[PDB]
Enzyme design. Structure first.
Site: not given
Ligand SMILES: O=c1c(O[C@@H]2OC[C@@H](O)[C@H](O)[C@H]2O)c(-c2ccc(O)c(O)c2)oc2cc(O)cc(O)c12
Ligand SMILES: O=c1ccn([C@@H]2O[C@H](COP(=O)(O)OP(=O)(O)O)[C@@H](O)[C@H]2O)c(=O)[nH]1
Length: 453
Positions: A15, A112
């Protein structure tokens, strides 16, 4: 007029890096960027600040949460299972974010996860939930039709798209099972993972995604219809050039291989494979007979690569393959002419980095909705890569399935490999088209101006 934008990405390299890529593009257009970053992490981010007079880092002290290892700032510092505790730590930065917004007074804050919009609207700041993952993923898992099923959302429910979803792709049982369970697991401060993101979508003033109309368009449109607020596209966030040249030790080693002959394999900066799949992956790379560079953390339970390698592996692979655990300059390696193939976990950042380069794409999505959905889009919609086959129920691959996917795309005479090369070229030519990112940013910035009007 130029905008003052604050950046508050999640504490993850995947990110921080695209947020910084975009920050550079915005600063090139004269916008002032206040970039909030965990304190110690700032030092590793300076290499990417191409406009230090417009992009200023503001350190955050990542607070202690019980269970968070000492000094941890990023998901690259903790086991994946500790991400929710790091999210509690992000939540706990609220007091120092409040102070930073009151003194800096940005017009917009990109963020985020921190469902912040209550604070910003008190301060007259616009909140902008800016995703660097695929809007196809958010649309599939976090659109209102999914959340209204609450805990009645089953794996079978998740095998089909939510109502109105614009495209079709197939999930395997174990993937739908994954999505159905992990969705409910707390991700910071007692908040279930999908509820957190849904809260952000619901409460933010506007939403944005990395991406362009040509690829992400249908999902941004679906989300705009579902949430009734602007869902913008930043453009594909093409990687900017770092101020740090490629490490000479990698440059020298990569330079000893024929152009297009080397298989680069990397599964991002967060995850660790289990040993059996670590073995299958490495043996599969070995079976191809191609030189390879595998950037992998030691598997679960192991602390060194050496201790986890299959028996006799180093002695067999000799100088043709390296398995390496440290952070490397992935973007610069993917640009190196030696790389013929990228075996990727399908993280959104790695996908873009592969797409803008010449490497054939081999899709090895790990168990994460965005990786899986990226892999289906890349393999079945854009058809720019070949996905390694996983067991329907166990989610495991064989070394032979790894071998076969790499062999297919590296074989000049294989029609599927020629197809994905041709389709990748079409997508690369789109993403790098002289006016594609710039026209995306033109629209993006006009809509940000509308947001603050
Ligand atoms: O992988 C996912 C993800 O990013 C990941 O979310 C999990 C963290 O551990 C990771 O670092 C990150 O990249 C995020 C996310 C990222 C930024 C945001 O502002 C937010 O609200 C959600 O949503 C997800 C929603 C899902 O249904 C499935 C996913 O697979 C993710
Ligand atoms: O050793 C590494 C591992 C990762 N990356 C970069 O870190 C980001 C990883 O983001 P991605 O979404 O691909 O995956 P994640 O690491 O978040 O799982 C990308 O920009 C990669 O180029 C890197 O430069 N070196």
């Amino acid at each position: 007029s130029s905008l003052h934008i604050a950046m508050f990405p999640w504490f993850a390299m995947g990110h921080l890096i695209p947020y910084l890529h975009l920050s550079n593009k915005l600063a090139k257009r004269g916008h002032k960027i206040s970039f909030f970053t965990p304190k110690k992490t700032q030092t590793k981010l300076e290499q990417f600040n191409l406009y230090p007079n417009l992009i200023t880092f503001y350190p955050l002290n990542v607070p202690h949460v019980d269970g968070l290892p000492f000094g941890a700032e990023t998901t690259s510092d903790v086991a994946i299972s500790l991400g929710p505790i790091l999210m509690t730590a992000m939540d706990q930065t609220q007091n120092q974010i409040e102070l930073l917004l009151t003194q800096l007074k940005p017009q917009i804050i990109f963020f985020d996860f921190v469902f912040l919009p209550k604070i910003t609207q008190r301060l007259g700041i616009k909140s902008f939930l800016y995703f660097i993952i695929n809007p196809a993923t958010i649309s599939y898992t976090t659109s209102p039709p999914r959340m209204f099923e609450a805990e009645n959302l089953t794996e079978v429910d998740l095998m089909k798209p939510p109502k109105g979803y614009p495209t079709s792709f197939n999930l395997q049982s174990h993937e739908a099972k994954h999505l159905a369970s992990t969705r409910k697991i707390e991700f910071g401060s007692g908040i279930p993972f999908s509820v957190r993101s849904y809260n952000c979508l619901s409460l933010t003033d506007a939403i944005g995604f990395k991406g362009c109309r040509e690829i992400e368009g249908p999902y941004v449109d679906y989300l705009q219809e579902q949430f009734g607020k602007p869902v913008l596209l930043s453009g594909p966030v093409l990687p900017e050039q770092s101020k740090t040249a490629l490490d000479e030790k990698w440059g020298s080693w990569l330079g000893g291989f024929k152009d297009g002959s080397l298989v680069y394999c990397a599964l991002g900066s967060e995850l660790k494979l289990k040993q059996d799949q670590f073995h299958e992956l490495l043996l599969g790379l070995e079976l191809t007979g191609f030189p390879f560079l595998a950037i992998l953390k030691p598997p679960v339970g192991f602390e060194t690569i050496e201790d986890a390698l299959p028996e006799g592996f180093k002695e067999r692979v000799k100088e043709k393959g390296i398995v390496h655990s440290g952070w490397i300059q992935q973007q610069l390696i993917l640009e190196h002419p030696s790389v013929g193939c990228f075996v990727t976990h399908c993280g959104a950042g790695s996908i873009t980095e592969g797409l803008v380069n010449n490497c054939q794409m081999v899709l090895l999505p790990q168990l994460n909705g965005d990786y899986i959905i990226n892999a289906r889009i890349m393999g079945r919609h854009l058809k720019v890569g070949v996905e390694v086959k996983k067991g329907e129920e166990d989610g495991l691959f064989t070394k032979e399935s790894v071998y076969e996917a790499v062999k297919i795309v590296m074989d000049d005479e294989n029609e599927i490999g020629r197809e994905v090369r041709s389709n990748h070229t079409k997508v690369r030519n789109l993403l790098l088209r002289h006016d594609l990112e710039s026209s995306c940013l033109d629209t993006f910035c006009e809509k940000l101006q509308e947001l603050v009007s």
